[PDB]
Design an enzyme around this catalytic site. Structure first.
Site, PDB file in Angstrom:
ATOM      1  N   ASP A  32      -5.280  -2.958  -9.309  1.00 39.39           N
ATOM      2  CA  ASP A  32      -4.732  -3.580 -10.522  1.00 39.39           C
ATOM      3  C   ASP A  32      -3.793  -4.676  -9.968  1.00 39.39           C
ATOM      4  O   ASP A  32      -3.209  -4.487  -8.897  1.00 39.39           O
ATOM      5  CB  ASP A  32      -3.851  -2.597 -11.324  1.00 39.39           C
ATOM      6  CG  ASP A  32      -4.600  -1.369 -11.835  1.00 39.39           C
ATOM      7  OD1 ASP A  32      -5.480  -1.515 -12.711  1.00 39.39           O
ATOM      8  OD2 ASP A  32      -4.283  -0.250 -11.366  1.00 39.39           O
TER       9      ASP A  32
ATOM     10  N   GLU B  10       9.109 -10.824 -21.846  1.00 34.84           N
ATOM     11  CA  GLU B  10      10.110 -11.198 -22.834  1.00 34.84           C
ATOM     12  C   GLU B  10      11.468 -11.404 -22.223  1.00 34.84           C
ATOM     13  O   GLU B  10      12.198 -12.284 -22.664  1.00 34.84           O
ATOM     14  CB  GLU B  10      10.206 -10.169 -23.956  1.00 34.84           C
ATOM     15  CG  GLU B  10       9.134 -10.337 -25.005  1.00 34.84           C
ATOM     16  CD  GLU B  10       9.438  -9.540 -26.251  1.00 34.84           C
ATOM     17  OE1 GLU B  10      10.148  -8.523 -26.128  1.00 34.84           O
ATOM     18  OE2 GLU B  10       8.962  -9.916 -27.342  1.00 34.84           O
TER      19      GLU B  10
ATOM     20  N   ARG C  37       1.390 -17.897 -16.594  1.00 34.48           N
ATOM     21  CA  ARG C  37       1.008 -17.318 -17.864  1.00 34.48           C
ATOM     22  C   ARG C  37       1.703 -18.188 -18.900  1.00 34.48           C
ATOM     23  O   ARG C  37       2.937 -18.178 -19.015  1.00 34.48           O
ATOM     24  CB  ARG C  37       1.506 -15.866 -17.970  1.00 34.48           C
ATOM     25  CG  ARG C  37       1.125 -15.130 -19.254  1.00 34.48           C
ATOM     26  CD  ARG C  37       1.410 -13.643 -19.081  1.00 34.48           C
ATOM     27  NE  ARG C  37       1.065 -12.825 -20.244  1.00 34.48           N
ATOM     28  CZ  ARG C  37       1.778 -12.755 -21.369  1.00 34.48           C
ATOM     29  NH1 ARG C  37       2.894 -13.458 -21.503  1.00 34.48           N
ATOM     30  NH2 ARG C  37       1.381 -11.970 -22.361  1.00 34.48           N
TER      31      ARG C  37
ATOM     32  N   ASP D  47      -3.096   4.589 -13.268  1.00 35.12           N
ATOM     33  CA  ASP D  47      -2.034   5.493 -13.728  1.00 35.12           C
ATOM     34  C   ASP D  47      -2.358   5.786 -15.177  1.00 35.12           C
ATOM     35  O   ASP D  47      -3.273   5.183 -15.740  1.00 35.12           O
ATOM     36  CB  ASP D  47      -0.637   4.875 -13.608  1.00 35.12           C
ATOM     37  CG  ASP D  47      -0.510   3.585 -14.367  1.00 35.12           C
ATOM     38  OD1 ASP D  47      -1.560   3.065 -14.822  1.00 35.12           O
ATOM     39  OD2 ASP D  47       0.632   3.086 -14.502  1.00 35.12           O
TER      40      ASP D  47
ATOM     41  N   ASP E 185      -6.698   6.207 -16.675  1.00 31.92           N
ATOM     42  CA  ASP E 185      -7.387   5.995 -15.413  1.00 31.92           C
ATOM     43  C   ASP E 185      -7.779   7.237 -14.621  1.00 31.92           C
ATOM     44  O   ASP E 185      -8.551   7.145 -13.671  1.00 31.92           O
ATOM     45  CB  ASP E 185      -6.561   5.065 -14.534  1.00 31.92           C
ATOM     46  CG  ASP E 185      -6.263   3.750 -15.210  1.00 31.92           C
ATOM     47  OD1 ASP E 185      -7.158   3.208 -15.897  1.00 31.92           O
ATOM     48  OD2 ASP E 185      -5.129   3.258 -15.046  1.00 31.92           O
TER      49      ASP E 185
ATOM     50  N   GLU F  95     -18.908  26.802  28.323  1.00 31.94           N
ATOM     51  CA  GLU F  95     -18.771  28.231  28.083  1.00 31.94           C
ATOM     52  C   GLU F  95     -20.119  28.910  27.881  1.00 31.94           C
ATOM     53  O   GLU F  95     -20.373  29.972  28.444  1.00 31.94           O
ATOM     54  CB  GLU F  95     -17.890  28.465  26.854  1.00 31.94           C
ATOM     55  CG  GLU F  95     -16.398  28.474  27.146  1.00 31.94           C
ATOM     56  CD  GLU F  95     -15.559  28.457  25.884  1.00 31.94           C
ATOM     57  OE1 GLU F  95     -15.821  29.265  24.958  1.00 31.94           O
ATOM     58  OE2 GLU F  95     -14.629  27.630  25.822  1.00 31.94           O
TER      59      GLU F  95
END
Ligand code: NA
Length: 994
Positions: A351, A442, A560, A703, A707, A771
């Site tokens: 992500d 914000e 953005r 998370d 998911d 062995e």
């Protein structure tokens, strides 16, 4: 009733034949409970201790060992003697290891905890419903609620089931749907129906989901679904329906168990086919029973010398050790078998926000319109410095610091960024840095208005904690916030209705401040503001705006963009229904475009590098983000996932584009994709399936129970440290720091660790070869047993265990990350390697028997009978070869065993040095390269002696201290094991490297 969100509140009442004012009737309750069952996720298999103990004996090699203890037990019983203090040691020792083995296995299970049982943490004990048999509300166990029940929830309640909201009693209702996503940001619910019947949860704004919490308000609603039919219930079924395969090592080890077994049997049959000569012997005479005790004696030893008894412990100690080592690097692995898996990781799906990026927003630019005049148009672009949330920075036009108050468009721009915002700031004196209160995007705006200060308000006087929301508090006093229309993906914007402060008897002056994604917002503007004036929006000036927006979010800026506008003539406060979000876009129309702010969410400083390590390591990287396609790609080019100027037309999809592709084509798109933007709920899981159909070892981040399904499916599910506890328990590893790099660092740690396992794995198994040679040798030569079970075991668990473990600290190759992901199919030992250990085997087995014979022959203490061959007899029922002499029990002299054993032990300590490198000579890579190895050898030798002098022990093992001559002989017969392999390695380096 699954489609409740799309139906009317009336339809949901009708459908269930229930009245909202009275609720279900005792009869209805009975029948609804009968049809839908109780409201709770099914229980997990009650794996009983007994069954758990039995599982400790499922493996094939343990059965053999158990079987061996059986023959051992009988042999140490059907034997004739008196030494009962050293007769049952063998059988008891075998049984006792199987017990510790079983004991250990059960210890794991008791502490292990699955994710399905983690989901039950979200189901509350009680719920509040309205049912006919009563007047007032009644609280019952959430397991007793049923579809159709009229339920009641209030701030603090953990929603008991999937509920269609009928009526909101409080002013507004707020829910924390965090457990689904992780973003505790409460969301506002409504009651109007959501039209699209196939709407994902995020858009079911009239639904409450079992497991979530009420953050604010009170509501009444009808139960749409319960149990495994709810959202989290359907997530519990996906997870349960998911079986995680055995790790490459586990599979390759299990396959080894089959072969080893098929060999232990063939060698036993082999020992039979060799003594077939006994059929041609007279039935009379010869102790037949003494002939069977002979075989079963070697069967036990054969098997005990075949199994790498200490391998499991060594693997664990190495894995456990490495894990703490990974944890120091922020990687918290929950599964030891995962450490191996992680190394072969071929694809990592991460992500972006918070993992690839810091999720620390900051506005970097903003632009308003300078002037419009016919075809001519000019904007005013600015820049802002500072990238923390702290109000420290500045605005500059063409780098030259300007003053915001001198531009009107910026006055309003600021008013919007301040009023149209549910977030704030706060100075955490404890940490000494300003922190965000609310959302990242914000707060970036709350911060922006502080550096802007369009009103040149004296703030330098103010303290620190006060400086936080200064310019904001100011703008606020200028406007009364009547109410705010929440954000919704349909329209992709939010607004706030504001009226002036200084107003008594006025019916004009109200305003709406809109904020949101550029395309939608701009399309609803018929007006562009130029300072204080306003002019109509025209085709050209719209290109300029969109043009710039595209340059900022698509270019090297990867910003953005948020468009800001205000509705000058907002509909009357009475003509608005603040109940139907469906009417919000309508209410936010005929706006005036004010400006734009471009924020940045910065790539972790270490990501650029980490992405390259992957490219070097042949590990693909897929970024899963929420950005639109354009900016998703932009950010990809920026961090290295994409070449700055390369085609990606077929390597970046939106959930939309992806869904349209037909199954066959999606599978394809997944093999070449590196960017998935705006991905749907079922995609991480579908992306994981497709990736596995190409045999890709996949890592997937996530998370929130959302998911958990994908996490469980992927080979390496990766959860954020800050993620939900279910996402965590549903994963292979947890990122203590949430940083993508922590992943890569851990993958490189898994390659180091698997290389070192190949070493101690081959070391130990190769040791078992010598062995089985020794035992088989001693037999096909009718010699006195050279070594016995009690001994073989001590070496496989202790003597060889210490070295094996030290081998895990072998230094890692410099080219660890410059080679592609290891193939899960790649076999441990094969081809030349087999020959090598097969030869090293022969020599070790030959040398042990020989060290015994040397004493029995060319030695003093023992019979100087050279070429006498004990092969002949061992019954002494004739005593021919030794006429004059009443002695025959020297065949059991403790010296011969001690010579062979010291050979084994000493040869294996030398072989622990031949294991420092697969093919590099001890000349190139010295023994002191691994100090831990040296220490381990000194310790193992000190232990060997320990059993040679501390009385209780020298009898238990049947040994006797060696003469400096004898010890000096062991060295002679041991040391050459080094030249042998040195010769074999040489051949590997010079006549195979192609
Ligand atoms: Na997994």
């Amino acid at each position: 009733m699954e489609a409740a969100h799309s139906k009317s509140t009336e339809e949901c009442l009708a459908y269930f034949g229930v009245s909202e004012t009275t609720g279900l009737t005792p009869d209805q309750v009975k029948r609804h409970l009968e049809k839908y069952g109780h409201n709770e996720l099914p229980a997990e298999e009650g794996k009983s201790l007994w069954e758990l103990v039995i599982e400790q004996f499922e493996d094939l090699l343990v059965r053999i060992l158990l079987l061996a203890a059986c023959i051992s037990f009988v042999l140490a019983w059907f034997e004739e003697g008196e030494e009962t203090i050293t007769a049952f040691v063998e059988p008891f020792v075998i049984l006792l290891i199987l017990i510790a083995n079983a004991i250990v296995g059960v210890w794991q299970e008791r502490n292990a905890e699955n994710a399905i049982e983690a989901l039950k943490e979200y189901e509350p004990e009680m719920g509040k419903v309205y049912r006919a048999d009563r007047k007032s509300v009644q609280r019952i166990k959430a397991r007793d609620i049923v579809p159709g029940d009229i339920v009641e929830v209030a701030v603090g309640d953990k929603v008991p089931a999937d509920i269609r909201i009928l009526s909101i009693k409080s002013t507004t209702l707020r829910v924390d749907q965090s457990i689904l996503t992780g973003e505790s940001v409460s969301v506002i619910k409504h009651t109007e129906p959501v039209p699209d019947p196939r709407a994902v949860n995020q858009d079911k704004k009239n639904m409450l989901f079992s497991g979530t919490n009420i953050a604010a308000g009170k509501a009444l609603g009808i139960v749409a679904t319960t149990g495994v039919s709810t959202e989290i219930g359907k997530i519990r079924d996906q997870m349960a329906a998911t079986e995680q395969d055995k790790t490459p090592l586990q599979q390759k080890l299990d396959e080894f168990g089959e072969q080893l077994s098929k060999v232990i049997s063939l060698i036993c049959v082999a020992v039979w086919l060799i003594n077939i000569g006994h059929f041609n012997d007279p039935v009379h005479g010869g102790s037949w029973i003494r002939g069977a005790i002979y075989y079963f004696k070697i069967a036990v030893a054969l098997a005990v010398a075949a199994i790498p008894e200490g391998l499991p412990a060594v693997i664990t100690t190495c894995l456990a050790l490495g894990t703490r080592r990974m944890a120091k690097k922020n990687a918290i692995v929950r599964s030891l078998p995962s450490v191996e898996t992680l190394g072969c990781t071929s694809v990592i799906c991460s992500d972006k926000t918070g993992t690839l990026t810091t999720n620390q927003m900051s506005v970097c630019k903003m632009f308003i319109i300078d002037k419009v005049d016919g075809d001519f148009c000019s904007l005013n672009e600015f820049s802002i410095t500072g990238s923390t949330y702290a109000p420290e920075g500045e605005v500059l036009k063409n780098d030259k610091p300007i003053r915001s108050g001198q531009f009107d468009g910026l006055v309003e721009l600021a008013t919007i960024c301040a009023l149209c915002n549910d977030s704030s700031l706060d100075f955490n004196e404890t940490k000494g840095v300003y922190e965000k209160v609310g959302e990242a995007t914000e707060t970036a705006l709350t911060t922006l208005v502080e550096k802007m200060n369009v009103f040149n308000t004296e703030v330098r006087n103010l303290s620190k904690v006060e400086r936080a929301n200064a310019c904001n508090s100011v703008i606020r006093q200028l406007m009364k916030k009547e109410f705010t229309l929440e954000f919704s993906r349909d329209r992709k914007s939010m607004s706030v209705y504001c009226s002036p402060a200084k107003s008594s008897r006025a019916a004009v002056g109200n305003k709406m401040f809109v904020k949101g994604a550029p395309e939608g917002v701009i399309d609803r503007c018929n007006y562009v503001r130029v300072g204080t004036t306003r002019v109509p929006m025209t085709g050209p000036v719209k290109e300029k705006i969109l043009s710039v927006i595209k340059e900022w979010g698509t270019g090297r800026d990867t910003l953005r963009c948020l468009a800001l506008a205000t509705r000058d003539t907002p509909p009357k406060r009475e003509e608005m229904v603040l109940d139907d979000s469906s009417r919000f876009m309508e209410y936010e129309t005929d706006l005036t475009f004010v400006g734009v702010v471009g924020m940045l969410d910065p790539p972790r400083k270490e990501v650029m590098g980490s992405i390259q390590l992957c490219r070097d390591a042949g590990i693909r990287v897929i970024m899963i983000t929420g950005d639109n396609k354009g900016t998703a790609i932009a950010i990809c080019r920026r961090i290295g996932i994409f070449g700055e100027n390369e085609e990606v037309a077929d390597r970046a999809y939106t959930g939309r584009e992806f869904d349209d592709l037909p199954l066959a084509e999606q599978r394809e798109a997944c093999r070449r994709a590196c960017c998935f933007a705006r991905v749907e709920p079922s995609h991480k899981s579908k992306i994981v399936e497709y990736l596995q159909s190409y045999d890709e070892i996949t890592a997937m981040t996530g998370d929130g129970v959302n998911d958990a399904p994908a996490l469980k499916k992927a080979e390496i599910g990766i959860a954020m440290g800050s993620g939900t506890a279910v996402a965590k328990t549903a994963s292979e590893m947890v990122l203590a720091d949430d940083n993508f790099s922590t992943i890569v660092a851990a993958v490189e740690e898994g390659r180091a660790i698997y290389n070192n396992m190949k070493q101690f794995i081959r070391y130990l198994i190769s040791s078992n070869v010598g062995e089985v040679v020794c035992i088989f040798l001693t037999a096909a030569l009718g010699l006195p047993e050279a070594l016995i079970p009690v001994q073989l075991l001590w070496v496989n668990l202790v003597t060889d265990g210490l070295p094996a473990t030290a081998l895990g600290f072998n230094p890692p190759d410099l080219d660890i990350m410059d080679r592609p992901p290891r193939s899960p199919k790649e076999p441990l030992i094969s081809g030349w390697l087999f020959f090598r250990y097969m030869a090293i085997g022969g020599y070790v087995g030959a040398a042990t028997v020989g060290a015994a014979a040397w004493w029995f022959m060319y030695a003093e203490d023992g019979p100087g009978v050279t070429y006498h061959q004990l092969t002949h007899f061992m019954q002494c029922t004739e005593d021919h070869p030794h006429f004059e002499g009443l002695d025959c029990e020297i065949f059991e002299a403790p010296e011969p065993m001690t010579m062979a054993l010291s050979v084994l032990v000493t040869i294996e300590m030398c072989n622990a040095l031949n294991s420092l490198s697969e093919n590099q000579s001890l000349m190139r890579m010295p023994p002191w390269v691994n100090i831990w190895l040296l220490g381990s050898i000194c310790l193992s030798m000190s232990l060997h002696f320990l059993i040679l002098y501390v009385d209780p022990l020298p009898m238990i093992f049947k040994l006797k201290a060696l003469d400096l001559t004898q010890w000096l002989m062991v060295l002679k017969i041991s040391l050459p094991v080094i030249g042998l392999d040195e010769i074999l390695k040489f051949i590997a380096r010079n006549y195979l490297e192609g």
